[PDB]
Amino acid sequence: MRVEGAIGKTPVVRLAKVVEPDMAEVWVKLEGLNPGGSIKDRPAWYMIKDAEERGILRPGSGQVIVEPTSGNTGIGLAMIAASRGYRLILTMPAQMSEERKRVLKAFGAELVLTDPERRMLAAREEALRLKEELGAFMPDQFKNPANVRAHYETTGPELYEALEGRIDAFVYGSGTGGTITGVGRYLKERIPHVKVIAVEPARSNVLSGGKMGQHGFQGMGPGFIPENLDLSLLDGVIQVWEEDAFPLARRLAREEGLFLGMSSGGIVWAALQVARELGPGKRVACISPDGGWKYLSTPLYA
Amino acid sequence: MRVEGAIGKTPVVRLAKVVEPDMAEVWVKLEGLNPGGSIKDRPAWYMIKDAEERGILRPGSGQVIVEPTSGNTGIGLAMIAASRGYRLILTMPAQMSEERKRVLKAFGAELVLTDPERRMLAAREEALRLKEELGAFMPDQFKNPANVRAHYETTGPELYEALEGRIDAFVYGSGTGGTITGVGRYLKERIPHVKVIAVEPARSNVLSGGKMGQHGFQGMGPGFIPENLDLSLLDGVIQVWEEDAFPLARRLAREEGLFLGMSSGGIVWAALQVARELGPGKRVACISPDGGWKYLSTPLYA
Numbered sequence: 001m002r003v004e005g006a007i008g009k010t011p012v013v014r015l016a017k018v019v020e021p022d023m024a025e026v027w028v029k030l031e032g033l034n035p036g037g038s039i040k041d042r043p044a045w046y047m048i049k050d051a052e053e054r055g056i057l058r059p060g061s062g063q064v065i066v067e068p069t070s071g072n073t074g075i076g077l078a079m080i081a082a083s084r085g086y087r088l089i090l091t092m093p094a095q096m097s098e099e100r101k102r103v104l105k106a107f108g109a110e111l112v113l114t115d116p117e118r119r120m121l122a123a124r125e126e127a128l129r130l131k132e133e134l135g136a137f138m139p140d141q142f143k144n145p146a147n148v149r150a151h152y153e154t155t156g157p158e159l160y161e162a163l164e165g166r167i168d169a170f171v172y173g174s175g176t177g178g179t180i181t182g183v184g185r186y187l188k189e190r191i192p193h194v195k196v197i198a199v200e201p202a203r204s205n206v207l208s209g210g211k212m213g214q215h216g217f218q219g220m221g222p223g224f225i226p227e228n229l230d231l232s233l234l235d236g237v238i239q240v241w242e243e244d245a246f247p248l249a250r251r252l253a254r255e256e257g258l259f260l261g262m263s264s265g266g267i268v269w270a271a272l273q274v275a276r277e278l279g280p281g282k283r284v285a286c287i288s289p290d291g292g293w294k295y296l297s298t299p300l301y302a
Numbered sequence: 303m304r305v306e307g308a309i310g311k312t313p314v315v316r317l318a319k320v321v322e323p324d325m326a327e328v329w330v331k332l333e334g335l336n337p338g339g340s341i342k343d344r345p346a347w348y349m350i351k352d353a354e355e356r357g358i359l360r361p362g363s364g365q366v367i368v369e370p371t372s373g374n375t376g377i378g379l380a381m382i383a384a385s386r387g388y389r390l391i392l393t394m395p396a397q398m399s400e401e402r403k404r405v406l407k408a409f410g411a412e413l414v415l416t417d418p419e420r421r422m423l424a425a426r427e428e429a430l431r432l433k434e435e436l437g438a439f440m441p442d443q444f445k446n447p448a449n450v451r452a453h454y455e456t457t458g459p460e461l462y463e464a465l466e467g468r469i470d471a472f473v474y475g476s477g478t479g480g481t482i483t484g485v486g487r488y489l490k491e492r493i494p495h496v497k498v499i500a501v502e503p504a505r506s507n508v509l510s511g512g513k514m515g516q517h518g519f520q521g522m523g524p525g526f527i528p529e530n531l532d533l534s535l536l537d538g539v540i541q542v543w544e545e546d547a548f549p550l551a552r553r554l555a556r557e558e559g560l561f562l563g564m565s566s567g568g569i570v571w572a573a574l575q576v577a578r579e580l581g582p583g584k585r586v587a588c589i590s591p592d593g594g595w596k597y598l599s600t601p602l603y604a
């Protein structure tokens with residue numbers, strides 16, 4: 001098989017030190033163990049495979065794929081494009097870190113650096129311009145239903161099976177909305193009482209009725225409500241602060257041997273809050289989007 | 303389960319672009335998908351578990367473990383020590399990169415920086431001094447048979463099973479010798495004709511009768527013959543140059559979607575040479591010790 005075949009089937013671990021006796025069990029699915037280093041491997045593969053199934057793409061064609069991202073989705077798309085023979089162009093603000101650019105270029109992605117002042121807007125604009133000029137395929141991660149489908153068909157079933165259908169609450173820090181929608185729907189169809197709780201940065205708390213803002217939870221909290229997020233599934237929203245999440249992420253690494261990413265610290269912090277509310281005997285499940293490997297040069301581990 | 307339970311059961315992928323039609327199949331087992339980021343998770347866990355079984359250690363005791371390493375074994379040991387409640391002290395030359403120190407400290411390992419001029423010798427000396435002063439447990443990765451056992455009991459069986467017992471040659475870049483000895487023995491006991499080929503840096507070619515020297519294949523080629531390496535198992539030794547291995551590693555990332563480490567480039571390069579020799583129909587298996595994540599600030603991906 002090829003690298004795309006190695007995506008998924010990730011393990012789930014039960015926290016034992018950062019939890020307290022009055023809390024429900026807390027289980028964390030480790031998506032950083034994917035070949036691309038994050039949970040985004042799943043929607044990256046699904047969006048490309050879906051495009052192949054629909055006839056938009058054919059592998060080994062050299063066809064162009066373009067997406068305005070420099071994050072985990074960019075890494076996942078680059079990995080798949082490399083394996084299946086597609087030309088990938090990623091647009092992103094020019095103030096992008098050298099480290100991240102090196103990872104993307106390692107996979108052969110072409111990078112187009114856009115106006116640092118216009119931020120994400122300029123990146124989106126260039127991706128649209130390229131899509132039109134080249135007749136390229138744009139995954140469109142925030143609106144593509146195949147993103148949600150990836151989680152409804154793989155992540156959800158895996159989580160449900162591993163925890164033997166015993167889940168009282170599912171907690172996740174939403175980015176594109178694909179994971180919480182896909183997993184959330186899968187669980188709610190089988191567990192009548194399960195609660196689906198979204199997590200977002202207090203500094204960019206739009207789901208809570210607040211306002212967008214800069215924050216340090218890379219990968220989550222886009223500052224807007226994506227089309228792939230089904231709000232009707234949510235039973236609540238927990239706002240998290242880096243001041244609380246980062247120290248917790250460090251505890252996870254030193255006390256549980258779980259070296260996770262920035263968003264994982266926020267997600268697990270929220271999961272613990274839910275665990276205290278539900279109490280002993282109950283089970284809270286959450287997902288770690290990625291490991292700490294890409295963040296050694298950030299406040300989390302610096 | 304805990305993080306140590308998530309070690310192993312790694313996938314194997316078949317190369318499709320860097321290979322040529324006149325070559326045997328080339329399969330690569332991805333050990334970078336382990337929770338600690340490398341194949342060393344296996345011997346790290348086995349050496350600690352073996353010590354617990356023998357009564358040297360008891361988990362959650364706070365007992366001290368000391369080892370002269372700053373590499374993947376250090377990361378693996380730190381992860382396990384964090385999860386099972388041991389105090390880990392790692393000794394290493396003071397010229398250690400900040401990046402690596404950050405990973406080790408993230409897991410809670412205590413670092414003792416030794417004389418930069420005495421290199422590894424000073425690190426070994428301090429570990430021995432601490433072992434004596436504190437009555438600590440020193441895994442002793444180059445001589446501990448539990449290292450070999452990890453691969454004889456897990457890595458080998460996994461590789462054999464995944465390739466349905468059809469393996470004509472096993473190729474690996476030796477460090478402590480545990481992997482090639484453990485996997486090699488497992489395969490030779492079942493495949494009468496299988497060849498076990500060791501790989502080492504041409505710049506530190508001691509297995510080839512040459513001399514030790516500085517090289518860039520982090521994790522392999524220790525410059526000496528470790529006690530854990532069973533020379534009687536070897537059917538040959540291939541010397542590799544960074545000049546050849548690094549460009550190949552970049553091709554693997556851009557053409558196969560396999561973002562691997564420095565030693566993987568050397569190991570796969572050698573595997574391709576063996577594949578050309580065996581020809582079509584045959585099957586060559588090798589292992590990628592780790593991914594490219596820890597090497598973005600090295601000549602390989604810089």
Ligand SMILES: *Cc1c(COP(=O)(O)O)cnc(C)c1O
Nearest residue numbers: 072175176177178179219263289
């Ligand atoms: C993508 C991502 C998320 C959010 O997952 P979605 O399915 O997009 O909601 C969270 N953290 C990180 C690090 C991510 O890359």
Ligand SMILES: *Cc1c(COP(=O)(O)O)cnc(C)c1O
Nearest residue numbers: 374477478479480481521565591
């Ligand atoms: C440990 C290691 C090796 C060698 O494996 P051994 O079982 O110790 O021979 C090769 N490459 C890397 C990156 C390693 O960490």
